[PDB]
Amino acid sequence: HYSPNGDASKATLRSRQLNISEQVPRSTQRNETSNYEVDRTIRH
Amino acid sequence: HYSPNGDASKATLRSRQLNISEQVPRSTQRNETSNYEVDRTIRH
Amino acid sequence: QFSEQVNYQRALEGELARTIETLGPVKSARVHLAMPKPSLFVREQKSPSASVTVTLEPGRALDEGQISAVVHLVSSAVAGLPPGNVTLVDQSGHLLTQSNDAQLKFANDVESRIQRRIEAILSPIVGNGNVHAQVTAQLDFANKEQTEEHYSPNGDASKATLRSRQLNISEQVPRSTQRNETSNYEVDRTIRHTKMNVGDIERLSVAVVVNYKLPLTADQMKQIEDLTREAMGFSDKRGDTLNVVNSPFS
Amino acid sequence: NDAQLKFANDVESRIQRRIEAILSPIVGNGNVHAQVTAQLDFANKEQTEEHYSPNGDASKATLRSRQLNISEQVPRSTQRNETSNYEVDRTIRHTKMNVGDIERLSVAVVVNYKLPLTADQMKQIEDLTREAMGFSDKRGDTLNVVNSPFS
Amino acid sequence: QFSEQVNYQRALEGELARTIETLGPVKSARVHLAMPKPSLFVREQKSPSASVTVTLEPGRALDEGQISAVVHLVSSAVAGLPPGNVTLVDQSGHLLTQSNDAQLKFANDVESRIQRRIEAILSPIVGNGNVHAQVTAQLDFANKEQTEEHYSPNGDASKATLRSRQLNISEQVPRSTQRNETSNYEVDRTIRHTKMNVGDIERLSVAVVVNYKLPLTADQMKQIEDLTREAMGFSDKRGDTLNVVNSPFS
Amino acid sequence: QFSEQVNYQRALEGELARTIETLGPVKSARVHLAMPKPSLFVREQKSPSASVTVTLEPGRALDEGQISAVVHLVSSAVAGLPPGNVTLVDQSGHLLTQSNDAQLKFANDVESRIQRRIEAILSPIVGNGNVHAQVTAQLDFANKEQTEEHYSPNGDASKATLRSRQLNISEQVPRSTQRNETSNYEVDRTIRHTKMNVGDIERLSVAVVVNYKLPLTADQMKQIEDLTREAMGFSDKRGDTLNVVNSPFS
Amino acid sequence: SWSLSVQTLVFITSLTFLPAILLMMTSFTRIIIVFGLLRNALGTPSAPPNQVLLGLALFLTFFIMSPVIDKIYVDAYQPFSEQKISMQEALDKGAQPLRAFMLRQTREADLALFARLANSGPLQGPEAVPMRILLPAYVTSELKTAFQIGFTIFIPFLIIDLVIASVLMALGMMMVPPATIALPFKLMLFVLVDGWQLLMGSLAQSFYS
Amino acid sequence: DRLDAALRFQQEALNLRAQRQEILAANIANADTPGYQARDIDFASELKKVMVRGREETGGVALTLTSSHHIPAQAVSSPAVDLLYRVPDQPSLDGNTVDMDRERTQFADNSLKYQMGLTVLGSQLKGMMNVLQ
Amino acid sequence: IALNDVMADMQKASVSMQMGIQVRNKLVAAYQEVMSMQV
Amino acid sequence: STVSFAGQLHAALDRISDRQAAARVQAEKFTLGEPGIALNDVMADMQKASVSMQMGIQVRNKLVAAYQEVMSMQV
Amino acid sequence: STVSFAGQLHAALDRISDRQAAARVQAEKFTLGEPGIALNDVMADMQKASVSMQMGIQVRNKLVAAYQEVMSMQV
Amino acid sequence: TSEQWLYWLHLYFWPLLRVLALISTAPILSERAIPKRVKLGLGIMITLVIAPSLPANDTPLFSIAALWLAMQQILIGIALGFTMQFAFAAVRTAGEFIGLQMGLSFATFVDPGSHLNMPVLARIMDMLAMLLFLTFNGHLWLISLLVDTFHTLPIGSNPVNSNAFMALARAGGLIFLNGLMLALPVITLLLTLNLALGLLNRMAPQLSIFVIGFPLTLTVGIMLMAALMPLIAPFCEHLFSEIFNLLADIVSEMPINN
């Protein structure tokens, strides 16, 4: 079993790189790289 | 168990690089890298 | 090249027996030593031991002082032997050596010391059997550790310490000003290595009961409370608690 | 492990005896009793202080080297590069504190009646027992003296 | 082999038992030495010990001085034996050694010295037993290490010391000017290696009582006070503390 | 093989004993030499010792100079035995072997010396028994080190010392001026290596009382105080303290 | 100091000198001579030197030099690792314990001869003698000691030989070859008293004393 | 170790030469874009900074390393060297301050010094291999 | 990874392996020379 | 004194080492950008140090071969 | 799970081969007349493939040297 | 394949060094018949199987300050293989002394450069014990114990303790003991024969053991050792097992003693 971290309110990040770049003909750009840490249970 | 660090008001950072820029027709930019450290409980 | 060592050790068993026996309130006292023995492979030589059984004088028992006496005797006879590992038994059970629960006895000892001191100080005021007390002691048996690294702050240049400094200044006159400054500091540092003692008093609680003469005067009561506060070594920070009452005894 | 108690008992007895030795001739042989409680610091102590002295003032600076470049034209263009390798005083203590000092003493003293002793006759005796306590204000030492008849 | 050194052990133990008897309150003293081994695999060299049990003379009790006497008798009869290892037992127990506390006795000796000196000075003025004093000593048993590295400040160019100097001065005349300078110095230096003593007096507390002749004259009190300050070696900086009172004895 | 040096030991014990026996106040000498082994498992090799318990002639005590005589005789007849390693005991008690409190002993010695000198000088002035004084001495036992490295100043060019010098002077005539100057000096220096002594006095506090003739005159008292300042070796930089008073004895 | 050049020349060459010079510098000479001599008694080899005796001497000398190697380790391999001691004080600090070890076993007149034929002038103290003089003197002294130990070991087996031959010839056994009779008696003496442990322990004790 | 402490300097210098090399080739490639503001770095100061501090390249993050088949991807990474502006001569109406002659003589110099560093490392490593055989 | 980094790594590892092998060769040779003597 | 094979050999190996060190310092300063030093100086001194290294290596090989030949003859 | 550096060598060889095959098929497509593909792109990819191939050859040479050296220690 | 591996290729070197020490020293592994390449490849090709699941990280320092680590591994190899040679020395003693009884070695008695008896009877029993060793689990238990040393004494700053080379030194020791305990019946019976044929000299001093004795004792020895050949098969069991135990002991003595 694992836990769902679809929500950032309960997500647990290890790394997050974030670039926001936009001009205002409004040219916009956004990048979001995320590495998560996940809860887990191993029932053997 | 990992604790959620979605809230920066309760997260822990090992490193953070933060680029903030803006020209004034305004051309703006923001870069932000973050490495966290996570609260962790390991039951066996 | 082997048996002579066992033979010698058993001879020494007899020797130690004859010493510890010839002590007065003893008629017989037989021991077994616990030493590494010649396997030709063991090199570590774990801590030894010495188990003594003694049959004392009928009608007599040995006090703790002479228990420690004989334990240190046999401990100082055998080289490289901690006296704690020497374990003594009476002629029927009743280990007079204490070698997980000793903290209970240590707490009881602390409480006895405090309470006996209270009685000794208050007997003159109210009388020999007119006051009783009991002490509860919170003892902390955790192996604490500490390593502090205070630095002294050198934000103030009037208290900083520059080993090396480079300072580049440039300007043109429409002014273009420039000032590059590099500083390497030497820093004041302190290193404490605190290792808290095992078994310290972290908290006390003492209830005092005093007899009547009819009740005592208020001031005599409050001074009694102050003295018992004192004889507790009362500390507000340790959470120490003290409560005193007066009423007829029975 | 338990011998800490023995040593503390010895210290407390010593102070008790000295207090009696001072006070008895003032009041009598059996007109006083004292009891001592000693908080004994049995923690293993090591310390290391490495004070440097501040060389902030060139009036008290010690330089090993100094490169100095001063340039200027006259549109006044002035430039001034400077390098200083200082050299510094240093003081290194290694105080490994003793094991088993007194961090705190509490002493209560009881004095018998002759009829109570007068105010001066009380303050002097309490000051004497303070003095014989080794009473240290920075140690949180504590003293309580009272006058009343014995049993 | 191995039987020869064991036989030497037994011979020496018998020798000490044989010749201990010529000591008065000695009638049997059974002893054992303990040297672990002349090793090959450890540099730790766990120390040998010695244990002795003796039977005293009925009708005679034994001082501590003769305790230390027999202890050093053994400890120097057999070298490779610091006296702490020697463990003496009475004919029935009674540990005569505490095998950390010599501090209490040493402080006692210091205080006895100073107190006796105060007595010897003040006795002629007021009488043989009209005075009493007791002294409390704070003793700094902590080990100290120290090192100071004082330098002389070479700020003053007239008092500074120069090993090298490159001094380049130029100018043009629209005035353009240049001045590049280098200076390598030599420095006066002080280097201590202070290693402070163990067990110094850090604070002395002295309380003095004097009997009456009727109260003594006031200047007589102040001169006696100055005397006790003087013989105390009273230093203000240490926090030394002094008190004097006059009152009839009992 | 080794039994040969064992018997060497055990015979020299007899010859030593019979030497001590020939002294007058001696009857026998229990002597035990103590040669542990000439090991090299440690860089110390604790000096081998020797213990003597002498049964004197009855009714005579053995004087400390003669105690030193016998101790030095034992340390001399025996190779590998320093005098301070010998132990000496009486047929009943009496540790005559006094080899941490050595500082107390030394301090008492010094104070006795200076105090005796004061009394010896003052007694003719005021009488044999009209004067008393005591001495309290602070002694330094910390190991010191010091290495001063004085350099002389060559800031003045009149008294400087040059190994080499490169000097360029240029000019054009718009005056283009240059002046380059490189100097490798060489510098006078002093280097001490002071290793201070252990046991030097830092502060003498001395209290003196003198009997009445009725009191002494002003000039007579002030000269008495001045001479005791003289005979103290009083130094104002050492913080020494001196106080002398006059009153009738009892 | 040396510069990624000579370092790893002096090291590899030192490893080259290891087996001869360094092994005969310390021990394994006395032990090997004594073992061979013991093999001369008790008859034939019966102990494969290329396989067993040499390795036994190797282990025994490891045990013997455990203290000097420990002191070398303390004086050099701690400080010389990464800081404050660099191959000049390291060399003398690491020479001191081995040199004391050799000087402690050298006969006090071997050094005399080797100084008197190296034309060395005065030698101020025991530490003043150089390795140049210390090596051959140590080797000669160790040869003397090895021969002494071998002689003592030969004593009892010689006694057994002569007593067995005497018994055989006195009981009338005119011309029996007493050697073959004596050899098992040699074994019996050597094993009943647990001879090997006695030998290695006695060597180890006598080697430093 | 002590093999990568003696060869460390030339390794770091040669890597820094390669980094300055693609900086200069970015100058060349943007020769005729408008408003480029040619960049360059100070080699001596940056080399001292690298030796004292390390690499400490700023800005870069790869994905995680879970079970295979999870499409590795990486962020845009750049060395920690602080790009310095090249002081321009001859303004050119489009902001582009890339002077062919300056950039190109610097390119040739950097190439030559990179080759020199390669030669020095080759010499040191051949020396090591010549000791060990 | 940088290319020059890869080749410098190549060569450093090669030299280290060569040095380890040569040291082992010297030690093995010393062992066999010790084991091939007469006793 | 005397020929001092140990001291002489130590001095020779020191000469090798300090020539290498001088070459390395020169190359360090050249690649750092310090003015002065020319390129041909760097290359020539580096090659000179390499030749000194090779001469030392060859001397070592010959001496090691000599020692191992002498210490193998049966006596 | 595991690295199994023979698997790493296999991965390196597969990378080299795939890069060369991609360059070859791009040259295929371009000379065939397929629109799109540019000449400078073809030449640049061929250049990169050549460099990777020489990468593989140099790694080959040094691995073979390393193996021929580890097979020389006497045991 | 970079140092991203090529310093993880530092995972192979130390275990390879230890395995190679054991192979170069072990009884069967280190026989001069094997081509050197086989022994080396077996070392490499054992460590490749054992190297994963060995968490090792060290550094071949220039002017190696960590050569004292390499020493360690070599030493442990010398511990495991060489000690197992004792079991052979024993029989190589026993049978040898048996020859020293019959007639075979009177050349080694009164004096030379030729011994000539090692070829005769010691190599019978030593290769018989060679086969007895191999036939188990001979070749293998040494390798399994080496892996066990990898797991008990992997890599460390405290590699070897003192008081532990005496174990192997005074271990044999059991070389003489076991050689006797094997050759005792044969020696005793030939002692009986020698003393009996000597007692014949009492009837006539002419009987001249050189003429009568040696042919009798040679046949007695050959026939008797034929009859007592099987007695070796149980003894070798002992002769190996105990020595293994010693190794096992020291291998398991070292960790709890470190």
From Swiss-Prot, chains A, B:
Subcellular location(s) of the protein: Cell inner membrane; Bacterial flagellum basal body
Polar residues biased stretches: 25-36
Its biological purpose: The M ring may be actively involved in energy transduction.
Induction pattern: Inhibited in nutrient-poor medium.
Disulfide bonds: none
Family: Belongs to the FliF family.
Quaternary structure annotation from Swiss-Prot or TrEMBL: The basal body constitutes a major portion of the flagellar organelle and consists of four rings (L,P,S, and M) mounted on a central rod. The M ring is integral to the inner membrane of the cell and may be connected to the flagellar rod via the S ring. The S (supramembrane ring) lies just distal to the M ring. The L and P rings lie in the outer membrane and the periplasmic space, respectively.
Name of the protein this chain belongs to: Flagellar M-ring protein
